[PDB]
Amino acid sequence: CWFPKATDTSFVEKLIQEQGNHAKFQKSKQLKDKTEFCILHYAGKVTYNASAWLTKNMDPLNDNVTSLLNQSSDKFVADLWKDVDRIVGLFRTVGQLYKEQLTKLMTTLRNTNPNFVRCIIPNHEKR
Amino acid sequence: FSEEQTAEFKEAFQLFDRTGDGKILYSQCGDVMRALGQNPTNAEVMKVLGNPKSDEMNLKTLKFEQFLPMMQTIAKNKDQGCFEDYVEGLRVFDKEGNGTVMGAEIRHVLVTLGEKMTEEEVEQLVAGHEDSNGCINYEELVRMVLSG
Amino acid sequence: LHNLRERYFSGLIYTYSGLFCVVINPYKQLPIYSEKIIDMYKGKKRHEM
C-alpha cells in the first residue's frame, strides 16, 4: 500500500505469491479482472474483491479543507475536527490500527470469565 | 409612510440634536435614516443631499419636513443585499473551505474595498466573533448584521 | 437438531447445551421479557427455572 507502481491488482497477484497454496486460500473464478480471492473461513468460503483496498487501507484526504475546518467558526465542527494532526497530505495503517486494538480486546476477554450465548439463524427468508 | 410612523419618525429625528434648533447636520442624515431601520449606501445618501462637500457637510442643516421627503425617496429602492450573495462574497476569503475567515483578513477587506470602513468600525463589528484562533464564521456574522 | 426443532416450534428458543446455550431466532414477538419475568428469575438458580 506504500509503493507507487502498486495497485489492488498488483496486490492480489503478490497475494497469490505468498499464500497461493495456503490450505485456507483459493483463487477466484478467473476474474483477476476484478481481481478477487477466496479464503476458507469457518462459516464457509468467500470471494473477496481486493479492489480499492489500498486506498481504504490508507484512508487519505484533502488536508487543505481538513484544517480549513480545524478552525472553522462553528465550534461543534471545531471540536469535532479540533484534532487533525494525522490527516494525509502527500502514519499508521488501518488494518493494523484495528488489528492492534482488537488484540487489546482479545486480551481482557482472556482475563475474564466467558459465558457463551450461541445465537442461531433459523432461515434466510426472514420468515 | 403612514402618519402612525411619520408621527414617530419625528420622535427619532428630534432625538438627534445636541444643541436644539431642531436641525440635523447634513452629515447625520445617514445615521438617522439608518436608526429608522434604513440601510442606504453612502452614495444613496449623497445623491439625495445634492452631493455637498465635506466642509459644507458639517455646516448645512436639516428640518424634519425637508428630511422626511428623503427618508421615503430612499425607503423605496431597486435592490438590496442578501445572505444568498452577501456571504457568497466573503466565502471567497475562506483560506481553505473551513467555513470561517480570519478576523484579520475580514478586518482588511472591509477597510480596503468599496465604501471603505474605519479601523474602529470593523473592530466594533467583528469584535467578539473571533474564536480562540481569531476565527469568525461569516455565515453567522452575515446574519448578525442582517437579522440584527 | 431434533430437540432444537421441537422446542423451537413449541415456542421456546433458549436451550442449554452443557455450559453454553443455543438460542434460535424466533423472528416473532414472543412474550418472555417483562418486569414480571425479570423478578421470576431474580436470584433463581440454574435449574429453579
What would the DSSP string read from start to end of A96-126? HHHHHHHHHHHHHHTTS------EE---SS-
One domain, residues B74 and B130: no
Give the N- to C-terminal CA distance of chain C in Å, as an integer.
23
Q: What is the CATH number of the domain that holds B95?
A: 1.10.238.10
CA distance A34 to A54: 14
Are β-strands B101-102 and A36-40 bridged in parallel, bridged antiparallel, or unpaired? unpaired
- For cell 465542527, what's the residue? A77
Closest CA to B90 of B80, B77, B79, B103: B103
Task: State the DSSP string of chain B.
Answer: --HHHHHHHHHHHHTT-SSSSS---TTTHHHHHHHTT----HHHHHGGGT---GGGGTT----HHHHHHHHHHHHS-S----HHHHHHHHGGG-TTSSS-EETTHHHHHTTTSSS---HHHHHHHHTT---TTSEE-HHHHHHHHHH-
Q: Which of B32, B61, B79 corresponds to the end of one domain?
A: B79
Contact (CB, 8 A) for B111 and B125? no
The CA angle B32-B34-B40, to the nearest 5 degrees, is: 115
- Residues B100, A72: C-beta atoms closer than 8 Å: yes
The values of phi and psi at residue C36, to 5°, are: -45, -60
Q: Within this chain, do residues B37 and B5 fall inside the same structural domain, yes or no?
A: yes
CA A126 distance to own-chain centroid: 29
Per-residue CA distances from C25 to A8, B54, C14, C17, C30 (Å): 39, 87, 9, 16, 11
Phi, psi (5° rounding) for residue C13? -105, -40
- Mention every residue, 6+ apart, whose C-beta is less than 8 A from residue B132: none
The string over B58-89, giving b where at least 16 C-beta atoms fall within 10 Å of a residue's C-beta and e elsewhere, is eebebebeebbebbeebeeeeeeeeeeebbee
SS3 content of chain C, % helix, strand, coil (to 5): 35, 20, 50
Record the cell numbers describing residue A120, joined without a space.
442461531
Single out the residue of B59, B82, B4, B68 nearest to residue B33, CA to CA: B68
Hey, what's the cell of A68?
480549513
Q: At what angle do helices B83-90 and B138-147 cross, to 10 degrees?
A: 140
Q: Which pairs count as long-range contacts for B77-83, CB under 8 Å and 24+ apart, including other chains? A: B77/B44, B80/B39, B83/B139, B83/B142, B83/B143, B83/B146
**Angle ∠(B40,B70,B84) on CA atoms, nearest 5:** 25
Nine cell digits for residue B25: 447636520
Distance CA B70, CA B46 (A): 11
- Examine the fold and report which residue of B29, B58, B79 is the final residue of a domain before the chain moves on: B79
Q: Report how far residue A98's alpha carbon sits from residue B48's, in angstroms, rounded to the nearest whole number.
A: 71
By three-state DSSP, how is residue C14 classified?
strand
Query: What's the number of CA atoms in the CB half-sphere (13 Å) around residue B34?
Result: 15
Q: Min CA distance, A120 vs chain C (Å)? A: 5
| Cell representation of residue B125 | 463589528
Residues B73 and B7 in one domain: yes
Residues of B in contact with A67 (CB under 8 A): 96, 98
DSSP codes, A25-65: EEE-SS-TTT-EEEEE-SS-EEEEE-TTHHHHTT----HHH
Please give the radius of gyration of chain A, using alpha carbons only, rounded to the nearest integer: 21
CB-based contacts of C38: which residues, under 8 Å, 6+ apart? none
Say yes or no: B4 and B62 in one domain: yes
Task: Evaluate whether B31 touches B47 at the Cβ level (below 8 Å).
Answer: no
Q: Which of C3, C10, C23 to mutate to test the interface with A (most CBs of A within 10 A)?
A: C23
Integer-rounded Cα Rg, in Å, for chain C is 12
User: φ and ψ at A7, to 5 degrees?
Assistant: -140, 155
The span from the CA of B105 to the CA of B97, in Å, is 15
Asked if B41 and B113 sit in the same domain, the reply is no
In whole angstroms, what is the distance from residue A127 CA to residue A112 CA? 37
Q: How many CB pairs under 8 A join A and B?
A: 43
Distance between CA atoms of residues B25 and B54, nearest Å: 11
* Residue after which a domain boundary falls, among B79, B106, B127: B79
Residues B47 and B95 in one domain: no
Does residue B5 share a domain with residue B55?
A: yes
Q: Tell me, yes or no, whether B6 and B50 share the same domain.
A: yes
Name the packing angle between helices B3-14 and B64-75 (round to 10°): 120
Provide the shortest C-alpha distance from residue A101 to chain C (in Å).
27
Q: Does A106 touch chain C (CB under 8 A)?
A: no
Q: Are B122 and B110 in contact (CB under 8 A)?
A: yes
Chain C residues with CB within 8 Å of chain A CB: 4, 8, 17, 19-25, 27
Cell of B117: 470602513
Grid coordinates of C22: 443455543
Measure the CA–CA gap between B86 and B39, rounded to whole angstroms.
14
- Residue B148 to residue B129: CA distance in whole angstroms: 15
In the DSSP assignment, the letter for residue C39 is H
Inter-chain CB proximity A67 and B129 less than 8 Å: no
- Say what the resolution is, in angstroms: 20.0
Q: Are A47 and A40 in contact (CB under 8 A)?
A: no
**B32: number of Cβ within 10 Å:** 21
Determine the structural domain holding residue B70 and report its residue range. 1-79
**A72 vs A82: CA distance, rounded Å:** 9
Are B68 and B87 in a shared domain? no
Method: electron diffraction
Give yes or no: residues B57 and B41 share one domain: yes
Domains identified in chain B, total number: 2
Based on the domain organization, do B59 and B105 belong to the same domain? no
Q: Which of A63, A117, A44, A75 minimizes the C-alpha distance to B129? A: A75
A–B touching, 3+ CB–CB pairs within 8 Å:
yes
Same domain (yes/no): B14, B39? yes
